[PDB]
Enzyme design. Structure first.
Site, PDB file in Angstrom:
ATOM      1  CG  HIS A 181      -9.671  -6.779   3.151  1.00  0.00           C
ATOM      2  ND1 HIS A 181      -8.915  -5.488   3.231  1.00  0.00           N
ATOM      3  CD2 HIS A 181      -8.992  -7.743   3.001  1.00  0.00           C
ATOM      4  CE1 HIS A 181      -7.817  -6.064   3.192  1.00  0.00           C
ATOM      5  NE2 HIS A 181      -7.485  -7.230   2.998  1.00  0.00           N
TER       6      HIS A 181
ATOM      7  CG  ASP B  56     -10.163  -2.524   4.470  1.00  0.00           C
ATOM      8  OD1 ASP B  56     -10.806  -3.365   5.248  1.00  0.00           O
ATOM      9  OD2 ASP B  56      -9.325  -2.950   3.775  1.00  0.00           O
TER      10      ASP B  56
ATOM     11  N   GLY C 258      -2.212 -11.701   1.834  1.00  0.00           N
ATOM     12  CA  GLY C 258      -1.907 -12.613   2.869  1.00  0.00           C
ATOM     13  C   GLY C 258      -1.126 -11.666   3.925  1.00  0.00           C
TER      14      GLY C 258
ATOM     15  CB  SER D 297      -5.331  -8.636   4.045  1.00  0.00           C
ATOM     16  OG  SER D 297      -5.397  -8.583   2.520  1.00  0.00           O
ATOM     17  N   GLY D 298      -4.429  -6.433   6.248  1.00  0.00           N
ATOM     18  CA  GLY D 298      -4.785  -6.063   7.994  1.00  0.00           C
ATOM     19  C   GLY D 298      -3.440  -6.022   8.589  1.00  0.00           C
TER      20      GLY D 298
HETATM   21  N1  LIG Z   1      -0.223  -4.281  -4.135  1.00  0.00           N
HETATM   22  C1  LIG Z   1      -0.558  -4.396  -2.913  1.00  0.00           C
HETATM   23  N2  LIG Z   1       0.166  -3.759  -1.915  1.00  0.00           N
HETATM   24  C2  LIG Z   1      -1.555  -5.488  -2.383  1.00  0.00           C
HETATM   25  C3  LIG Z   1      -2.192  -6.201  -3.084  1.00  0.00           C
HETATM   26  C4  LIG Z   1      -3.204  -6.913  -2.320  1.00  0.00           C
HETATM   27  C5  LIG Z   1      -4.083  -7.911  -2.892  1.00  0.00           C
HETATM   28  C6  LIG Z   1      -4.961  -8.451  -2.146  1.00  0.00           C
HETATM   29  C7  LIG Z   1      -4.985  -8.377  -0.718  1.00  0.00           C
HETATM   30  C8  LIG Z   1      -3.978  -7.412  -0.210  1.00  0.00           C
HETATM   31  C9  LIG Z   1      -3.209  -6.842  -1.034  1.00  0.00           C
HETATM   32  S1  LIG Z   1      -1.881  -5.269  -0.765  1.00  0.00           S
END
Ligand SMILES: NC(=[NH2+])c1cc2ccccc2s1
Ligand SMILES: [Ca+2]
Length: 223
Positions: A40, A84, A175, A177-178
């Protein structure tokens, strides 16, 4: 990362920041020429930044290398976020040193209960927006699949696992993510999704890297 702590400069040497004019995702260096991140996080025009701590200040240990190609997993479903994961090849090989190092892929999947380290430059508030400039860390255990599936009914596949605290308070967030989830020296997960951040009964959901080792190995050896 919410409820975590400042890692310390370059204590997470395999952590990567993907930048397309600004930081938008984290990643993990698996060898001098490749990085693994979340599908993503796919964008065209990515620059990989290694040896970072403060991402808004050049502190001297950084290596900024452009990507030569991106390979999103063939079965990635953007609607469910199943599979993902994505691989990014660098245009030049990174110089591995004490501040830039690769992380090992797992030989087997980890057990629920194993404690892991999650890191990233994502939001640090559950209700609100505060983006840190230095890397934040969090130690969280892998939760059993039963608690993961009860928190997210009909949404967890065999390629995902949950990690965190059902009481909320500590978790990964946008933020992040990844980014990496390392347990016992191996890269076991990738920050994928969740419902809000650090909410009670809504732990983080991570891509289960142990299910993609053959695909990773095969893909990198042929590209
Ligand atoms: N609750 C979580 N660990 C997350 C929520 C989000 C929301 C957007 C992008 C990545 C993530 S990780
Ligand atoms: Ca910097």
């Amino acid at each position: 990362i919410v409820g975590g702590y400042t890692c310390g400069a370059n204590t997470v040497p395999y952590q990567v920041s993907l930048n397309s004019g600004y930081h938008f995702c984290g990643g993990s260096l698996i060898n001098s020429q490749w990085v693994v991140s979340a599908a993503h996080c796919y964008k065209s025009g990515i620059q990989v930044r290694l040896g970072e701590d403060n991402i808004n200040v050049v502190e001297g240990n950084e290596q900024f290398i452009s990507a030569s190609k991106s390979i999103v997993h063939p079965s990635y479903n953007s609607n469910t976020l199943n599979n993902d994961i994505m691989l990014i090849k660098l245009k030049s090989a990174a110089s591995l040193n004490s501040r830039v190092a690769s992380i090992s892929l797992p030989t087997s999947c980890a057990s629920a209960g194993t404690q892991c380290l999650i890191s990233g430059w994502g939001n640090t508030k559950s209700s609100g927006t505060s983006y840190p400039d230095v890397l934040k860390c969090l130690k969280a255990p892998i939760l059993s699949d039963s608690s993961c599936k009860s928190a997210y009914p009909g949404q967890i596949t065999s390629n995902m696992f949950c990690a965190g605290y059902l009481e909320g308070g500590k978790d990964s967030c946008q933020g992040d993510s990844g980014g990496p989830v390392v347990c016992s020296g191996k890269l076991q997960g990738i920050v994928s999704w969740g419902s809000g951040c650090a909410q009670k009964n809504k732990p983080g959901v991570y891509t289960k890297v142990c299910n993609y080792v053959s695909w990773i190995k095969q893909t990198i050896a042929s590209n």
